[PDB]
Design a protein around this ligand. Structure first.
Ligand SMILES: [Mg+2]
Ligand SMILES: [Mg+2]
Ligand code: NA
Length: 269
């Protein structure tokens, strides 16, 4: 299939229950490597890479399509229809959280449940909302990406994963970051940091399970609280006693059980 080839779609497990695992910026579907073995016995598991990941063809990259998160939401829908999947649980890491939120407002029929890991509808600050970042901070971040991409990746990965340089996850993430073509990495990260999905949250109807590390460089806990307060369907908040923006990769011993519970169980009342 077209989307299956372009997004490295892999379908594992078995059964009528389907779980889609969608990774965030700088990594790929390997971010789920410790969760997948605990799902395949009970679920059909759909893995894919978002366009622009270092595992995808950079000559392909459609800069206009991916200048807005709507392009990534369209990709999710196209993958499910190409796979003829009419219903799934969608687990979205970082940017893939809001991508699933957007896809669920366009096509609520495709999702029985959203599970977000370190999602945020807005990273910039305004007088009534603290996203965590201001404009000149972002400017200097983007200039570092342009000036020395390898040095940027090497400094960014430990801060993002929230661990020392020699952490396994830091080293994995350093490598997947540096496999992105620098102009594509910059374009995607600008699309992410300048997004605003806040107006869409009240229009969500799919129940959402909102997960993050208590200490996440990219997501203040107050943002997760804001998501819970703004969503138009049922939702539950579970802040984890972990540090890091890729907690399913760096702290799987405790984060995999959290994800399993929220994939498996419905919100009470
Ligand atoms: Mg991201
Ligand atoms: Mg206001
Ligand atoms: Na639904």
């Amino acid at each position: 299939g077209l989307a299956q080839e372009a997004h490295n779609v892999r379908v594992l497990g078995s059964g009528p229950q389907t779980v889609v695992l969608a990774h965030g910026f700088g990594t790929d579907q390997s971010v789920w490597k410790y969760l997948v073995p605990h799902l395949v016995e009970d679920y059909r598991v759909v893995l894919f890479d978002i366009m622009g990941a270092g595992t995808t063809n950079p000559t392909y990259f459609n800069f206009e399509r991916y200048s807005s998160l709507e392009g990534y939401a369209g990709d999710v829908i196209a993958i499910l229809e190409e796979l003829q999947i009419s219903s799934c649980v969608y687990v979205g890491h970082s940017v893939s959280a809001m991508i699933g939120v957007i896809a669920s407002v366009t096509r609520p029929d495709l999702f029985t449940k959203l599970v977000t890991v370190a999602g945020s509808p807005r990273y910039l600050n305004d007088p009534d909302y603290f996203g965590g970042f201001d404009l000149d901070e972002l400017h200097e971040l983007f200039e570092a990406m342009k000036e020395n991409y390898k040095a940027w990746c090497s400094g960014f990965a430990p801060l993002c994963v929230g661990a020392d340089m020699e952490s396994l996850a830091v080293q994995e993430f350093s490598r997947t970051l540096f496999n992105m073509r620098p102009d594509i990495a910059l374009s995607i990260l600008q699309t992410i940091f300048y997004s605003d999905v806040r107006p869409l949250l009240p229009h969500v109807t799919v129940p959402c399970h909102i997960i993050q590390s208590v200490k996440d460089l990219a997501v203040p806990v107050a943002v997760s609280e804001y998501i819970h307060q703004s969503l138009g369907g049922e939702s539950i908040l579970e802040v984890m006693a972990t540090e890091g923006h890729l907690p399913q990769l760096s702290s799987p011993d405790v984060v995999v059980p959290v994800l399993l519970r929220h994939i498996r169980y419905a919100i009470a009342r």
